[PDB]
């Protein structure tokens, strides 16, 4: 009911540094909708609940994607726009603290365990199917979809990495760090909007709506 082959297919189907990062975020929000449509059973949920799940998880979903994309580089983040933000550039722009959190708690840990694209997609599908999201018409159905994702994820881990019995738990235990980092990035983005001297495009602005 939740095969990892379709979750990987969704990942492969979607392929001032503050300004560059905000422009990449808006670009990838469009791509995020196309990704979620390719996750099994997401498009079958009520349309209001599809909206709720994406508005609740977009920041974590985008952070996981560019963090995994950046395991190929050191002390840097690869943006979807083809630009690279070096650790030194982020520090010199005043956002070095949260940048270092992304490199240390996400990118380096992804690189250390060689997290593959199937595991990334499954973790993102778990984040997407967040049954704690407020306003869900049927939270039990979302919880059931989440359960099917991590059931398929564990089977994949035991089959492809039988020598790493703790790998399934290691993947899930990056989710608290992703949640904390996602919340801090939202905090920064609201401050940028309040000051008003950072260009924020329309889709990124819409995610900041009440």
């Amino acid at each position: 009911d939740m095969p990892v082959e379709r979750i990987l297919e969704a990942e492969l189907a979607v392929e001032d540094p503050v300004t560059n990062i905000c422009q990449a975020a808006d670009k990838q929000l469009f791509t995020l909708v196309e990704w979620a449509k390719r996750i099994p059973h997401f498009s079958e949920l009520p349309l209001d609940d599809q909206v709720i799940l994406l508005r609740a998880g977009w920041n974590e979903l985008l952070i996981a994607s560019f963090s995994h994309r950046s395991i190929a580089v050191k002390d840097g983040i690869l943006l979807a726009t083809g630009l690279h933000v070096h650790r030194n550039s982020a520090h010199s722009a005043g956002v070095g603290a949260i940048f270092d959190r992304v490199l240390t708690e996400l990118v380096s840990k992804m690189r250390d365990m060689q997290m593959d694209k199937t595991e990334l997609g499954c973790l993102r599908a778990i984040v997407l199917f967040n049954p704690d999201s407020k306003g869900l018409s049927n939270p039990a159905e979302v919880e059931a979809l989440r359960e099917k994702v991590y059931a398929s994820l564990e089977a994949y881990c035991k089959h492809k990495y039988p020598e790493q019995p703790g790998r399934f738990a290691k993947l899930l235990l990056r989710l608290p760090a992703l949640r904390s980092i996602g919340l801090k990035c939202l905090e920064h983005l609201f401050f940028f909007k309040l000051i008003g001297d950072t260009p924020i495009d329309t889709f990124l602005m819409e995610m900041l709506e009440a």
């Binding site: 909708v33 349309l47 909206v51 889709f203 819409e206 709506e209």
Partner: peptide, 10 residues
């Protein structure tokens, strides 16, 4: 949430 709504329906 105009943009998200339009993108999901299409």
């Amino acid at each position: 949430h105009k943009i998200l709504h339009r993108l999901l329906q299409d």
